[PDB]
Amino acid sequence: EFRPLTLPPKLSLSDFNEFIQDIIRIVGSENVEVISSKDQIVDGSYMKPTHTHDPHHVMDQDYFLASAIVAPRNVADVQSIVGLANKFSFPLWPISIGRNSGYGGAAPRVSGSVVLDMGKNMNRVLEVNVEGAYCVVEPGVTYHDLHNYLEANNLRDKLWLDVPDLGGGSVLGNAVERGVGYTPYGDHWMMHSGMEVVLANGELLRTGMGALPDPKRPETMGLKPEDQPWSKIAHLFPYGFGPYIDGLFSQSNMGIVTKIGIWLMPNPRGYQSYLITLPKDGDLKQAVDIIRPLRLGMALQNVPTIRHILLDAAVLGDKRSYSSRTEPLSDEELDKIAKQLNLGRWNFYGALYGPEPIRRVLWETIKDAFSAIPGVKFYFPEDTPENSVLRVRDKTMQGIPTYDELKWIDWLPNGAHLFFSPIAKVSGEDAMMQYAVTKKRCQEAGLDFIGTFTVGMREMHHIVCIVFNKKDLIQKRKVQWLMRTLIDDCAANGWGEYRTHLAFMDQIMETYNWNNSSFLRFNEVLKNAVDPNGIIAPGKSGVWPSQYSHVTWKL
Amino acid sequence: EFRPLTLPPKLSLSDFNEFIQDIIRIVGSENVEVISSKDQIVDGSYMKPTHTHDPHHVMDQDYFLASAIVAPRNVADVQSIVGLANKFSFPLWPISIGRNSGYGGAAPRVSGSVVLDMGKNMNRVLEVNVEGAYCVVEPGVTYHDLHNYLEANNLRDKLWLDVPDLGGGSVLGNAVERGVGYTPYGDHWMMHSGMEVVLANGELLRTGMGALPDPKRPETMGLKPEDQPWSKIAHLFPYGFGPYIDGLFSQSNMGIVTKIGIWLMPNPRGYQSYLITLPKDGDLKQAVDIIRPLRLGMALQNVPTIRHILLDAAVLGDKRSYSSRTEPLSDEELDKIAKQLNLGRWNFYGALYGPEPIRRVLWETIKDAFSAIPGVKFYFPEDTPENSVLRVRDKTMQGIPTYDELKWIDWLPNGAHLFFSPIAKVSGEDAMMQYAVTKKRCQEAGLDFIGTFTVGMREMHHIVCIVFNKKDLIQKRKVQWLMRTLIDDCAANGWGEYRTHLAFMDQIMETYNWNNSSFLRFNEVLKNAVDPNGIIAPGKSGVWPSQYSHVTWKL
Amino acid sequence: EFRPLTLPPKLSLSDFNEFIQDIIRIVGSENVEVISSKDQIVDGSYMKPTHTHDPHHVMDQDYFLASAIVAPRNVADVQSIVGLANKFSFPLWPISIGRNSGYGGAAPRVSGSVVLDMGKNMNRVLEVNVEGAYCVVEPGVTYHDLHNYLEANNLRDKLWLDVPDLGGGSVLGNAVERGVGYTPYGDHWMMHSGMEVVLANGELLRTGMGALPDPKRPETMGLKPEDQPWSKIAHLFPYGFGPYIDGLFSQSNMGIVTKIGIWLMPNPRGYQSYLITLPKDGDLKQAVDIIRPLRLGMALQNVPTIRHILLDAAVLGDKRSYSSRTEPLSDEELDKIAKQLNLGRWNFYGALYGPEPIRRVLWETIKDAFSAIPGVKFYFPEDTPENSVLRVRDKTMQGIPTYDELKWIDWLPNGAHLFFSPIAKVSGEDAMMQYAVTKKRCQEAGLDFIGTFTVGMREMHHIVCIVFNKKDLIQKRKVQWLMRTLIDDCAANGWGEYRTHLAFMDQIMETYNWNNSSFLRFNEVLKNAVDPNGIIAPGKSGVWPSQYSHVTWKL
Ligand SMILES: *Cc1cc2c(cc1C)nc1c(=O)[nH]c(=O)nc-1n2C[C@H](O)[C@H](O)[C@H](O)COP(=O)(O)OP(=O)(O)OC[C@H]1O[C@@H](n2cnc3c(N)ncnc32)[C@H](O)[C@@H]1O
Ligand SMILES: *Cc1cc2c(cc1C)nc1c(=O)[nH]c(=O)nc-1n2C[C@H](O)[C@H](O)[C@H](O)COP(=O)(O)OP(=O)(O)OC[C@H]1O[C@@H](n2cnc3c(N)ncnc32)[C@H](O)[C@@H]1O
Numbered sequence A, B, C: 001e002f003r004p005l006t007l008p009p010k011l012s013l014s015d016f017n018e019f020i021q022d023i024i025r026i027v028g029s030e031n032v033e034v035i036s037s038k039d040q041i042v043d044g045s046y047m048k049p050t051h052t053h054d055p056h057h058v059m060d061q062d063y064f065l066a067s068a069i070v071a072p073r074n075v076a077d078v079q080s081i082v083g084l085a086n087k088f089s090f091p092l093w094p095i096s097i098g099r100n101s102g103y104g105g106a107a108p109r110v111s112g113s114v115v116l117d118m119g120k121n122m123n124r125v126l127e128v129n130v131e132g133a134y135c136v137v138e139p140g141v142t143y144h145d146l147h148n149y150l151e152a153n154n155l156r157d158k159l160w161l162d163v164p165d166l167g168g169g170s171v172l173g174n175a176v177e178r179g180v181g182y183t184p185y186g187d188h189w190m191m192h193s194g195m196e197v198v199l200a201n202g203e204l205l206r207t208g209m210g211a212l213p214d215p216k217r218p219e220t221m222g223l224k225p226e227d228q229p230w231s232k233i234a235h236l237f238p239y240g241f242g243p244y245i246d247g248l249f250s251q252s253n254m255g256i257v258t259k260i261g262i263w264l265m266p267n268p269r270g271y272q273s274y275l276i277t278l279p280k281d282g283d284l285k286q287a288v289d290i291i292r293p294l295r296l297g298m299a300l301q302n303v304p305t306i307r308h309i310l311l312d313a314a315v316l317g318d319k320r321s322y323s324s325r326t327e328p329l330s331d332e333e334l335d336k337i338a339k340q341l342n343l344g345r346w347n348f349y350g351a352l353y354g355p356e357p358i359r360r361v362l363w364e365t366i367k368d369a370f371s372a373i374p375g376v377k378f379y380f381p382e383d384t385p386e387n388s389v390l391r392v393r394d395k396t397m398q399g400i401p402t403y404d405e406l407k408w409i410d411w412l413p414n415g416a417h418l419f420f421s422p423i424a425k426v427s428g429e430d431a432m433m434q435y436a437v438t439k440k441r442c443q444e445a446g447l448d449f450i451g452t453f454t455v456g457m458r459e460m461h462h463i464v465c466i467v468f469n470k471k472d473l474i475q476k477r478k479v480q481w482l483m484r485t486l487i488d489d490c491a492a493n494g495w496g497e498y499r500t501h502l503a504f505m506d507q508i509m510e511t512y513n514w515n516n517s518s519f520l521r522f523n524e525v526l527k528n529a530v531d532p533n534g535i536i537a538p539g540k541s542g543v544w545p546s547q548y549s550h551v552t553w554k555l
């Protein structure tokens, strides 16, 4: 329609109208939804994600938000749209599925921007190669989707996924965000090979070997470039020749993604998932010094998770169902909890991979290792209650999608998530030292600390899990406050966040300040060169086209 | 001095003189060598690499070549020099050690360019972190150098390298080139985390977490930025936050490198190196279908090498010492050879890693697998002649540097190497099919095919090893001819070269043509944005600043 | 000469030489000193200030530093020089006298810059108007100089100065820096009216009424503009008409100053100086709540000083002469000290002004007020030891210059000063709260806190007096560390530094960050508009011309 609630910059309304008109004129009235009124107030459900904004909203609901939604039906649409977005300096905000909750979701950093709902149309599994062990997909291929495909093609016996805690995210969006999963193939971004992208100027690109063109043949003649098959090695060798640019494409506004090759993990013929429970909060420390060499030793296989009891607990029940108390729960209450549960204070989930002769020693290796930790306790799914999270993580650690996790998003009544994700070494000390802070602050903020550590190889992803009730302002402000505070400390102590929410992108990019913002500066430089017009989602990762004021924009 | 043999573009001589004057005025007369005359004709030795040009020269000796050599004494020097190089539009050609033989060596794509001999001064091991398992180095830290360091620090017991066939290359240059080595840590570029670079405009940058600044402290105050320590995670987590740009830094002219974090491989406590010999030339095919799933299965550990007999043979002796014949040796002569040697036609080198319970099954696994191949034969170093290459590769597969390889560079009298390095799937067929061609052509070119395959995980690096006598023109022309021919075919069949010589950069970047050179186009765009002046080694990877004509420049 | 140790940016050496040649060619070989070698290592004495760099150097000695010194002989010289500085993009660094010690002294933020020693030639008292009560001076009129003038003109009986703790600073440099003195006329910058400045483009300007041109007359015809007399009101009314721009001229690189009108304080016919001593460290708190309304009440007249015992003590003796101990002195040692001295822990100096009937009540007013503070004790100079600082401050509070202060610069052996100068409310609490921090940190830094508070009217200038031994690196680093730390806290708690050293300009301008650096941004904007070339002392107050990289430049 005619009158969206928010116009992007300097966009006049007739201009908005024309744009929106040429646009419906391409993609179909079907492919567009304007956002005419607050009857938008509608945040949604994981099952049916809203695109207009951030559901897990810490800011005012309407704070970051669409002017309109646009669902390109195919690459050329994106191309056309960019052209228009280019004609009018309308800005973009592409997304794949929108489950980017706890970071912003569908919500665009710049309000009045257009939402490029890619995945809606662009749902395809382009290919799944067994010999190469990989798949090629679109923004719309959600994981489950990816799964059922192999399923309805009996592939699971030949091949395997690597999911994140939840099943519905875009395999593609996730890889660009540098999302992480739990099988040894957990480092998603790194498992990519050959992607295609519509650059800021509308022109297509195929990274790496995506560039060595498939040789011609009758069969393939006359297909649009976005339609031509790929060279042999495209998807089996990420680097190509010359600059390795693919990275400009992750957590950046360099281009709009349309496709990507993700490598698949070949069924291993042997899979043992387990859980060593850690008794003392201080366990976390020895626990890590422990995992340290096993991870570097490869005795540890996939990316193992070290959980804080409440994550498990909260998956099991809301906060209220364990304490009808407003404040943070006492440290003694967790201990009751660990127990009511059989859990640890801390809880380490991992999985074994391979022929049994293989797993056996590994496991003799770990089990024997975790032994120095008193009250340590080991376990197979089997050995556990039928709602036990070890139950969920077994599927999880084998590429099977689930949706049991969100339940935890439920601790609080208008539970919403917000993730503080500082990186931390794999040193019990550092792990401890970082934890202290974050906690300390969750207390002051009046919160239940809840969070884990994704067991990186020489690093570790510290996911602080801040929930809070989205309908409680006193609180929302505390989170914001907590947010930016934790951001400073961590940094103050030397730790950066690896990915973050729309609302803190700036703050954190600011952490990245060596030599006077040089990194940021460099980015801008390339951003402008390539996106002179600032059309393609400006402000992401805290980077802005000249055209955007820092002052008018930052946060 | 005054009069170099070749001036870079539009550089007038007084201009050359001033530049060279302000320059000696910084780095010391010591740090500079002008190239006043053909008394330069001097190609050198691996032990003492020439910087002025390409030793393994296929082109006229003087074809690609310095105007002068400059050895920055420290980062600021590089900075200063860039500034001047910037003042005057003088162009750069940075290198670390120069052993880039078989690709160009020290030689600059653009003649009259200045040679930035980094490594000469910039020799330091900045750090070697055990807990993190990694080292931080300069352009000048050659591998051996890297080795002896750990050695003279008793580290080998805690940590391990990953060398390439030769010991003296720059750990750093090698990683940027995306060089590859043989331990499981063989994928060099990928083992990097945190690098620093002097951009085209003189400003410093530190990629990734290199950017999250180490927090302040008395101890560290007042040190130049190039001198400040790194944040904690800098070197344990390559991605940082926002765009993952590091890749603009590999096989590109985006910036000048000054430092880099390479992760180290923790001693594994168990190491078995071996060799299964392949009897028939056609073995190569089944051989691969074989390795295919073991590599994807991780039964295969490091990057294993599949050798062509002559590589081994030639390491053992020149060509003449096996046939006093000019032409390519008959296929029957190889067979005599395989035998005179105990070798296969093809020969697969690999290594086992870990506690023995660990290796045993693996090995039972491989050995049992290679079994379907008749006359197959397995072996430990022990089981072999004391000059046997299995002898050399054991050290090799454990990070120990050697220099036994070059000997092979000796097949021919004024042996020089030239590498054709097309990628190829891990399919016996493809492997075969690619081999056929390359060979076929080596024949026509009047050459001994010689080459291997670095066992990639879902790919394979096909290194065609073209030697030829550098002092034989009829021949040099045949190689050039062979070169560009093989380049077309491979491509014609769908295979790209992953890295190449100075003289073929263009040709190959041209292979990368999907959608009308889009990849190349994109590159230029960012290259100019960042290196408006085209000062920093123009033409690399076949990319050129506006300022350089395609026509005047390409090849 | 030929070869200065440091060239400014992109300046080539022949260029440096030409510049320096045309330049000697104007001002005389006499007016120039190149800085050819480290035989420069020479830091000097207050009596004979070095221009080349920072004497009180926290950084490496040579860290900030001249390329050459230039002493303009008259306004046109400055004009000429700018022109050249303009021709060549050579940068400027103007100074009046150089006693800007504890902030940088003569030292230029950008090394290789030229030092514009104004005051050397430009020594004149242009006028001293009795009727108007004001003087007009040049950069070279040091205070004492200003004094002796009135003296040798019997003026003191008619008029009075307002000095800062030391006598030799430039009356003019001091006013631009917003330096402060102790008579009621202590707010220096504010006592200005009509200034002249050579803008960045060489053109002259006269602020305010300086602009309403003196009407013509035979007597004045044909004099250069820099030579013409001023309009009547020029110097009696700072605002003029239209924009009140004078302020772009204080603690900014907007223009080069050549002259300025400072109003004079008419002898008051009655002057009583005194000192109430404060016993407890905690006294400082009640003490302030006390002064608060008297200052706002004008019962308090000039700007009174609240001293920390050690300042007085240190004026009396080095540190060693009270404790042969390296560490910070105990809090009990001060108490011995207060006593050995008759001093307070804290010590409040002020002065009475006017006809006696006038002073009497005031004093009855204060004395009676300070009474609630136990052990409080009052005093006239008379009532005190002949080296007593009350002795020095009496002259001080009456415009009489002295040089007794520096002695304190002597606490430490290679005593050097560094000033942390955060503003603080006039609330005992705030005063306390700010003090705590600063101290706390001086301890950790391993230092004697030493400092005061200039009794502002609704504010207070908290001068932390950091000394340290310039020849002790472990220490220098601690100060730097302390420096930037205190800067963050203060800010963290809401307090900004009002003026600072060369080395922290950036850091602090960064404190000034509301709305995303808007203030800084605005500044740059006007800076460039007016100093397109960045010639006029770039980086001051942390502001930089486009031409200067933040990254290359900041700190
Ligand atoms: C609530 C929650 C979230 C969560 C999690 C557990 C819970 C309970 N566990 C996660 C985990 O283990 N690992 C992980 O990486 N994330 C996890 N999250 C966060 C989130 O749910 C997932 O990461 C999810 O996969 C992210 O959302 P989705 O995959 O739906 O992606 P999106 O909203 O479409 O956005 C991706 C962002 O990247 C850029 N983008 C996306 N598509 C494109 C295209 N086509 N072109 C260019 N850029 C694209 C956009 O910036 C978009 O915002
Ligand atoms: C003759 C030969 C070569 C060879 C080999 C076996 C033989 C007998 N085996 C190799 C192997 O197993 N793996 C491999 O990657 N290479 C192998 N080669 C080739 C070569 O010897 C090595 O790769 C060698 O490490 C490369 O040379 P070196 O390491 O000395 O590097 P360089 O000449 O200095 O150049 C590196 C290139 O990259 C860019 N570069 C280098 N330093 C910088 C800095 N500081 N900043 C920016 N760019 C830099 C330049 O383009 C330079 O040309």
Ligand SMILES: *Cc1cc2c(cc1C)nc1c(=O)[nH]c(=O)nc-1n2C[C@H](O)[C@H](O)[C@H](O)COP(=O)(O)OP(=O)(O)OC[C@H]1O[C@@H](n2cnc3c(N)ncnc32)[C@H](O)[C@@H]1O
Pocket: C094, C095, C096, C097, C098, C099, C100, C101, C102, C105, C106, C118, C139, C164, C165, C166, C168, C169, C170, C171, C172, C173, C174, C176, C177, C178, C179, C180, C181, C255, C256, C257, C258, C405, C406, C409, C417, C540
């Ligand atoms: C060591 C010390 C310092 C001190 C003090 C007590 C001691 C023991 N007490 C001070 C006090 O009570 N009040 C005060 O304001 N400062 C005090 N200080 C610091 C210092 O000694 C004095 O402030 C002194 O007056 C400053 O130095 P000086 O007056 O010699 O000025 P300068 O070095 O030439 O520099 C002035 C700065 O401002 C700009 N400037 C100067 N002249 C010009 C011209 N002509 N045009 C444009 N800008 C100019 C420059 O940036 C220069 O750096």
